[PDB]
Amino acid sequence: RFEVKKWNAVALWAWDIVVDNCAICRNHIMDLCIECQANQASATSEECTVAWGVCNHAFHFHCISRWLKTRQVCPLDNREWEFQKY
Amino acid sequence: YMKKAEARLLEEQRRVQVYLHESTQDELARKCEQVLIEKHLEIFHTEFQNLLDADKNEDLGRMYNLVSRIQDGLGELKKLLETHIHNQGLAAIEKCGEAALNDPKMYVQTVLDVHKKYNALVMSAFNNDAGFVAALDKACGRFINNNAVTKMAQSSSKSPELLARYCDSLLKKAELEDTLNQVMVVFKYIEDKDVFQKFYAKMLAKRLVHQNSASDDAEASMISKLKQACGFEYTSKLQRMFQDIGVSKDLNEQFKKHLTNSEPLDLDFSIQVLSSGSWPFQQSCTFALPSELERSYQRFTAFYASRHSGRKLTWLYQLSKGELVTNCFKNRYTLQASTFQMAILLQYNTEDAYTVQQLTDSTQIKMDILAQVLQILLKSKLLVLVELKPDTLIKLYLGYKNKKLRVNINVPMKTEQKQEQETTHKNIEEDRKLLIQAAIVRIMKMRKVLKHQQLLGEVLTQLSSRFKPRVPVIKKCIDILIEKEYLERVDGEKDTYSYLA
Amino acid sequence: SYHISNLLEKMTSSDKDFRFMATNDLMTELQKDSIKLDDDSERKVVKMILKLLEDKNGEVQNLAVKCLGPLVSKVKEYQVETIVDTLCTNMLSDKEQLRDISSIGLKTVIGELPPAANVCKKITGRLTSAIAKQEDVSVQLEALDIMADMLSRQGGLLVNFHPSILTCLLPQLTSPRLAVRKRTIIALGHLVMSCGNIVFVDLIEHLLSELSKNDSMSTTRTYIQCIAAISRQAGHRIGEYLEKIIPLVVKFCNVDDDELREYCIQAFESFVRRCPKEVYPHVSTIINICLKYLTYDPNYNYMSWKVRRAAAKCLDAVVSTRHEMLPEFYKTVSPALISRFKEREENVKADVFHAYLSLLKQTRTPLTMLQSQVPNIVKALHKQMKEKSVKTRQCCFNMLTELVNVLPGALTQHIPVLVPGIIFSLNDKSSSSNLKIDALSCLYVILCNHSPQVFHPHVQALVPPVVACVGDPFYKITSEALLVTQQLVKVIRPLDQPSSFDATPYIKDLFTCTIKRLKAADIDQEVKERAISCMGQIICNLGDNLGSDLPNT
Numbered sequence A: 001r002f003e004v005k006k007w008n009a010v011a012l013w014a015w016d017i018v019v020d021n022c023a024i025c026r027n028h029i030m031d032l033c034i035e036c037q038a039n040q041a042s043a044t045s046e047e048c049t050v051a052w053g054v055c056n057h058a059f060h061f062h063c064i065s066r067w068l069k070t071r072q073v074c075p076l077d078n079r080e081w082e083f084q085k086y
Numbered sequence B: 001y002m003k004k005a006e007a008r009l010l011e012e013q014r015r016v017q018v019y020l021h022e023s024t025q026d027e028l029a030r031k032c033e034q035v036l037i038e039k040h041l042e043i044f045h046t047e048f049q050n051l052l053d054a055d056k057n058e059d060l061g062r063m064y065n066l067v068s069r070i071q072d073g074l075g076e077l078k079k080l081l082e083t084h085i086h087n088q089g090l091a092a093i094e095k096c097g098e099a100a101l102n103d104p105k106m107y108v109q110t111v112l113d114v115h116k117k118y119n120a121l122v123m124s125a126f127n128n129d130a131g132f133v134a135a136l137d138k139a140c141g142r143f144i145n146n147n148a149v150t151k152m153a154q155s156s157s158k159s160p161e162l163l164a165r166y167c168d169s170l171l172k173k174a175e176l177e178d179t180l181n182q183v184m185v186v187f188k189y190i191e192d193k194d195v196f197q198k199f200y201a202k203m204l205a206k207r208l209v210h211q212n213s214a215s216d217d218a219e220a221s222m223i224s225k226l227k228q229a230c231g232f233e234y235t236s237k238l239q240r241m242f243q244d245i246g247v248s249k250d251l252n253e254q255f256k257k258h259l260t261n262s263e264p265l266d267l268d269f270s271i272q273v274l275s276s277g278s279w280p281f282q283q284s285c286t287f288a289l290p291s292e293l294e295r296s297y298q299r300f301t302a303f304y305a306s307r308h309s310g311r312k313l314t315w316l317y318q319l320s321k322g323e324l325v326t327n328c329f330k331n332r333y334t335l336q337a338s339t340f341q342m343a344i345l346l347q348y349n350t351e352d353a354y355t356v357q358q359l360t361d362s363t364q365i366k367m368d369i370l371a372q373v374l375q376i377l378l379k380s381k382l383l384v385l386v387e388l389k390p391d392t393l394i395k396l397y398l399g400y401k402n403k404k405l406r407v408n409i410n411v412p413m414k415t416e417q418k419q420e421q422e423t424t425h426k427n428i429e430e431d432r433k434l435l436i437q438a439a440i441v442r443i444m445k446m447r448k449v450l451k452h453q454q455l456l457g458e459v460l461t462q463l464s465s466r467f468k469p470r471v472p473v474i475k476k477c478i479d480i481l482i483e484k485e486y487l488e489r490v491d492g493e494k495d496t497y498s499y500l501a
Numbered sequence C: 001s002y003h004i005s006n007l008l009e010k011m012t013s014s015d016k017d018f019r020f021m022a023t024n025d026l027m028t029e030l031q032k033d034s035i036k037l038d039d040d041s042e043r044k045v046v047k048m049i050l051k052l053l054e055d056k057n058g059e060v061q062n063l064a065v066k067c068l069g070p071l072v073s074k075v076k077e078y079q080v081e082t083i084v085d086t087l088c089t090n091m092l093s094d095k096e097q098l099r100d101i102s103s104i105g106l107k108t109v110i111g112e113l114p115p116a117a118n119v120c121k122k123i124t125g126r127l128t129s130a131i132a133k134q135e136d137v138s139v140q141l142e143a144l145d146i147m148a149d150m151l152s153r154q155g156g157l158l159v160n161f162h163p164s165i166l167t168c169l170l171p172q173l174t175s176p177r178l179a180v181r182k183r184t185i186i187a188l189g190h191l192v193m194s195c196g197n198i199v200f201v202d203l204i205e206h207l208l209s210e211l212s213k214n215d216s217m218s219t220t221r222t223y224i225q226c227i228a229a230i231s232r233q234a235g236h237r238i239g240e241y242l243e244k245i246i247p248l249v250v251k252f253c254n255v256d257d258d259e260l261r262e263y264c265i266q267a268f269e270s271f272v273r274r275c276p277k278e279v280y281p282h283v284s285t286i287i288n289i290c291l292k293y294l295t296y297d298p299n300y301n302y303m304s305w306k307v308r309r310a311a312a313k314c315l316d317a318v319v320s321t322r323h324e325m326l327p328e329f330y331k332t333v334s335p336a337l338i339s340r341f342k343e344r345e346e347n348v349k350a351d352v353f354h355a356y357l358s359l360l361k362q363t364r365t366p367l368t369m370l371q372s373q374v375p376n377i378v379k380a381l382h383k384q385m386k387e388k389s390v391k392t393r394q395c396c397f398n399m400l401t402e403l404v405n406v407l408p409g410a411l412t413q414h415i416p417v418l419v420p421g422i423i424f425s426l427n428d429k430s431s432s433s434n435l436k437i438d439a440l441s442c443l444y445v446i447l448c449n450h451s452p453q454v455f456h457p458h459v460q461a462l463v464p465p466v467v468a469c470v471g472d473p474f475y476k477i478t479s480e481a482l483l484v485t486q487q488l489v490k491v492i493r494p495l496d497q498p499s500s501f502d503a504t505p506y507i508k509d510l511f512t513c514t515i516k517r518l519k520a521a522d523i524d525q526e527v528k529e530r531a532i533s534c535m536g537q538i539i540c541n542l543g544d545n546l547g548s549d550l551p552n553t
């Protein structure tokens, strides 16, 4: 018989606007890109990861990389985009 | 003979000033210096090596004073001193053996003692000459980034990792300022600063989450030193975590004042809510919450959903700890354990014998993690039954005793350290590739058409303050950028690239 | 005019890459030979840099901070004033990022100023008011750091503001935050480096008056630390006040507080080291206090170790600088240290060992007193040589080596009790490479400075461990083993003296262990040279008893 006295837990918070999936492409964030999954395996498919921003928004690295070639704004909030994690 | 030569030179100066003409002074001094010094430089160099071998600072200072009169006579001394310092550093590192591969204190103290000794020698005897300082700097930079320890690890990135681990050991739970300053002096000679930055950030996050720091003043001083040495983005990244800690403290206070106007909870509850993009932690494995803890879970989830609308919380159960108090034993013991341990002890709350397969089904923990935590429990004499199988029988051991009422069982598992080190090294390599790609893209955006060698030179110039890139990696990044439709090879004029919109 | 206009057009391109590259190109142009004689471009460039200091991207902000350096060297003196004003007024802002980036930029600007008077005057005027404001702590700390940086270099330019600097600094030695006190102490030392005589006496008199009244325990420690720092930093200027300073510290030494005693002994050490001439009358009382508090341990009988460390370090400092004190040194200091070789704390033991090593180094009549004290040293070392700590045994071996180097024949009657310890350290799995090398060096020094007769009974015990050490995988051990083996060959059969010792049974072992190193072709150069020398000595001394191996050798 053991009794619990005190508990110290750690939690992380993320935006719930998107249901655990990319916003630019309608795919699960742990899966591959549309272009990556459509194309044959290559060096580009090796470097497919998840990129976070200062606004705590999560997209595929390739998705936001393609989005940034024309616009300099996060898709979900109108502020400028800055990479902070991979 | 050195003292004899100095005395003779003084006597000659006295003679020429007292009973000769003024026009003879320069020529007589030149001839005397020639005859007395320049003809014995071969002997002087061997004596210099011998005096360096057996520490004799006064003789070295006298010889520096003597040879400084001869034009271009100090170069050989500088080269010999640089070689001697390099050899001494290599020998000092080599004598520590294999133990220095997993002992940051020994490695850093050896380097620091060598540097202190030869800095003192340069300042005291050579009058802080620029060339001798440069020789000491080159020798230190040569033997810090390549030595016996780095050969064992087959990578020059072991030194920054050891330095960061030494800093973490220093800052964990008056003379600390001096050793921090000395460490920052060592940091200047390191070429792979990104490895140090990554390791320091990870260990600072671990320190902040678990609340084990010697003092906040030491952390502030180290942050100030990093401001002075590193850039401005890194310190901002650290300040983000420092701000999240305060936000979590305020939220804890608000939750505590909220619990008064409701039914109080049985246990003492504290939480650290952190942003998912500013901390190095990953998602936890599958885990079924113990039956005594859903109350706090639901209450805090409701409170957070009330105060913040569009956010969702993910719970890291591998970084959570707590207290278990036991009463069905010889005497009243209170023990500190992780959430996994608390879950896998309270499974047999009234039972006495389980099969690890049943324990796996009840706790929903994977194979390796459960095996490691069970081994840790068994080694603690708290539980009794080396290899384990799914049909192994493990039973609670009654009547165990310890010399102290307060016992902790949250000892780290051996494999996690090595796995974490490998993971962060791989992450560092991937980040290096990404920054090289970004630099190439930006340079091509600025200059529409540029050659190969100029591109490489500008890339190394831009990335020099963090690490020294390898040219094959730059070619690989260029090739992967060509495929991704970022830049294209122009027809004709081979080995030339142009930016493509 | 066109390149600069294009650069400033790009520096607001709404794309981070363009701004970064434009700022980098501007920085490269600034460090080059390009000059902008036009006074219309300078204002625009300065404003653009000061606005990019607040950019939304970290890289651009960092590059702008770095660009603030070369800008001041190639811009008229009017714009430097507005740059400094903008930075100083930004340090007082509510935004934390702006304050931090402005502090970094202001330190960078100060760094580039040649060792100028007007800008330093403005900076000092702003920072005095910044330090004076005690409402917030972060601004205080940043201002204190910048003031220390600005006083370390260019300190001699701002002579007129020294009264104001002292007046603003002095009240901060009482603030509830210890970081403020430490920064104030650093700034005060830097100020003492470049100051007039009036302010120095003002500071010393204020410190003495504040120490004369014991308002709080916390502040007294700060004042003692400040006095120690001032003494350590200035030196000669504080010597005239020791006659009044020392009795206060002596009175404070007797207070029952562990932290206070350590600071007092450190102040004593600083006085002993930095100013030698004015401490002559007080060496006796300093030594007596150090001896009294060297054995301070209330909760044990055969944080109280910090005072012991401080006392031993102060004794080391006293011994290492006074050469005329040697008779009374050997009269009183040496027995206490010898009796304290048995300290139960490793660090204090190491520091007392270092102190007695410094005494031995200074010893180079004192020799007769050292010879009389030798038996106690040997009796103390015999117990320490069997400890399980590598550092203690290393200290013992080093001190024996130094003692033999000072007195050539000091260990004639104690070889029977000293050889077993060396042997035990030689063949022990817990020993490290450094311990074995130190033991071999001690053995070599002992053998080189004594008559061969005293080692004859112990050759049978000394040969096997040395032969084993010759075959060690580590070459650094092998070199020292061969060096010891050469002297062992000299001892076993002397050539200039008659000996009745039989050297026959030990010839084969030495020859076999040396020949293998001699014919290696892949070992390090040092081992090759040592093997050649050792084999030459073997042939010279005992080459008559070798068989058919001589032609091949």
Ligand SMILES: [Zn+2]
Pocket (backbone or CB within 6 Å): A022, A023, A024, A025, A026, A027, A033, A034, A059, A060, A063
């Ligand atoms: Zn996507």
Ligand SMILES: [Zn+2]
Pocket (backbone or CB within 6 Å): A032, A033, A036, A048, A049, A060, A062, A063
């Ligand atoms: Zn992809």
Ligand SMILES: [Zn+2]
Pocket (backbone or CB within 6 Å): A053, A055, A056, A057, A074, A075, A076, A077
């Ligand atoms: Zn966003």
